[PDB]
Enzyme design. Structure first.
Site, PDB file in Angstrom:
ATOM      1  N   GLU A  21       0.899  -1.297   0.107  1.00 46.11           N
ATOM      2  CA  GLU A  21       0.097   0.004  -0.153  1.00 46.11           C
ATOM      3  C   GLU A  21       0.761   1.334   0.054  1.00 46.11           C
ATOM      4  O   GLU A  21       0.268   2.360  -0.456  1.00 46.11           O
ATOM      5  CB  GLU A  21      -0.929   0.200   0.985  1.00 46.11           C
TER       6      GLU A  21
ATOM      7  N   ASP B  95      -6.791   6.186  -4.810  1.00 40.99           N
ATOM      8  CA  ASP B  95      -6.333   4.926  -4.962  1.00 40.99           C
ATOM      9  C   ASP B  95      -6.231   4.631  -6.522  1.00 40.99           C
ATOM     10  O   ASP B  95      -6.764   5.175  -7.506  1.00 40.99           O
ATOM     11  CB  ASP B  95      -6.955   4.252  -3.862  1.00 40.99           C
TER      12      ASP B  95
ATOM     13  N   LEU C 172      -8.928   3.705   2.883  1.00 37.15           N
ATOM     14  CA  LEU C 172      -9.855   4.387   2.354  1.00 37.15           C
ATOM     15  C   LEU C 172     -10.798   5.421   2.950  1.00 37.15           C
ATOM     16  O   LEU C 172     -11.258   5.123   4.042  1.00 37.15           O
ATOM     17  CB  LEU C 172     -10.862   3.263   1.592  1.00 37.15           C
TER      18      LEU C 172
ATOM     19  N   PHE D  99      -8.204  -6.625   3.362  1.00 37.63           N
ATOM     20  CA  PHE D  99      -7.901  -5.318   3.615  1.00 37.63           C
ATOM     21  C   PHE D  99      -8.048  -4.647   2.358  1.00 37.63           C
ATOM     22  O   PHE D  99      -8.488  -3.909   2.614  1.00 37.63           O
ATOM     23  CB  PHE D  99      -6.390  -5.590   3.905  1.00 37.63           C
TER      24      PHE D  99
ATOM     25  N   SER E 113     -11.911 -20.377  -5.009  1.00 37.87           N
ATOM     26  CA  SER E 113     -10.665 -20.465  -4.463  1.00 37.87           C
ATOM     27  C   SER E 113     -10.632 -20.692  -3.076  1.00 37.87           C
ATOM     28  O   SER E 113      -9.821 -21.516  -2.712  1.00 37.87           O
ATOM     29  CB  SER E 113      -9.991 -19.185  -4.681  1.00 37.87           C
TER      30      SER E 113
ATOM     31  N   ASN F 247      -7.036 -20.411 -10.221  1.00 40.91           N
ATOM     32  CA  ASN F 247      -8.439 -19.614 -10.046  1.00 40.91           C
ATOM     33  C   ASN F 247      -8.537 -18.288  -9.528  1.00 40.91           C
ATOM     34  O   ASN F 247      -9.269 -17.492  -9.962  1.00 40.91           O
ATOM     35  CB  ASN F 247      -9.360 -20.695  -9.113  1.00 40.91           C
TER      36      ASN F 247
HETATM   37 KR   LIG Z   1      -9.587 -16.330  -1.494  1.00 41.84          KR
END
Ligand SMILES: [Kr]
Ligand SMILES: [Cl-]
Ligand SMILES: [Cl-]
Ligand SMILES: [Kr]
Ligand SMILES: [Kr]
Length: 162
Positions: A11, A20, A32, A104, A117, A132
């Site tokens: 970040e 961003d 944010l 996050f 996934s 995936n």
């Molecule tokens: Kr995930």
């Protein structure tokens, strides 16, 4: 390396309000502020988070305090999520740091949507999950970061961050 160091790399750190990668007002270590197009709305939200009239600027200590709170909320969101918790609990320490980075960045809701996934990571089918995970708008929009996180889930090591 740990989650803190990991996300500080992903970040960066900015002391003035900035937009961003999706063009939203943020400050700090990816905190944010608002999804709104209004710079004043962003400034209002920032003053409220810090507890003072910031005028769009904060200190490193203030950025770090918000960062601490955000990492915390992220973990807490995972633990309270019926879809997330069981996966996260089956993971080793390195991989869990990968799951937190994702939440996050895109939120709990967002990550809870990676149904396939998720199941693959619960099953320890590393390579399959990495393939995936990459079939996502997440990877096509921020590929260098997605790759780092994907490699972390694949290998269970911090190689991508050294
Ligand atoms: Kr995930
Ligand atoms: Cl806040
Ligand atoms: Cl990226
Ligand atoms: Kr997770
Ligand atoms: Kr995850």
């Amino acid at each position: 390396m740990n989650i803190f160091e990991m996300l500080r790399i992903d970040e960066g750190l900015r002391l003035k309000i900035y937009k961003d990668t999706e063009g939203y007002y943020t400050i700090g270590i990816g905190h944010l502020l608002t999804k709104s197009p209004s710079l004043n709305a962003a400034k209002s939200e920032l003053d409220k988070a810090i507890g003072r009239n910031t005028n769009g600027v904060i200190t490193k200590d203030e950025a770090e305090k918000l960062f601490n709170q955000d990492v915390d909320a992220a973990v807490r969101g995972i633990l309270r999520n019926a879809k997330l918790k069981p996966v996260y609990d089956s993971l080793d320490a390195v991989r869990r740091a990968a799951a937190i980075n994702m939440v996050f960045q895109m939120g709990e809701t967002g990550v809870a949507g990676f149904t396939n996934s998720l199941r693959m990571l619960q099953q320890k089918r590393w390579d399959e999950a990495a393939v995936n995970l990459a079939k996502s708008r997440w990877y096509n929009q921020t590929p260098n970061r997605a790759k780092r996180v994907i490699t972390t889930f694949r290998t269970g090591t911090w190689d991508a961050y050294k």
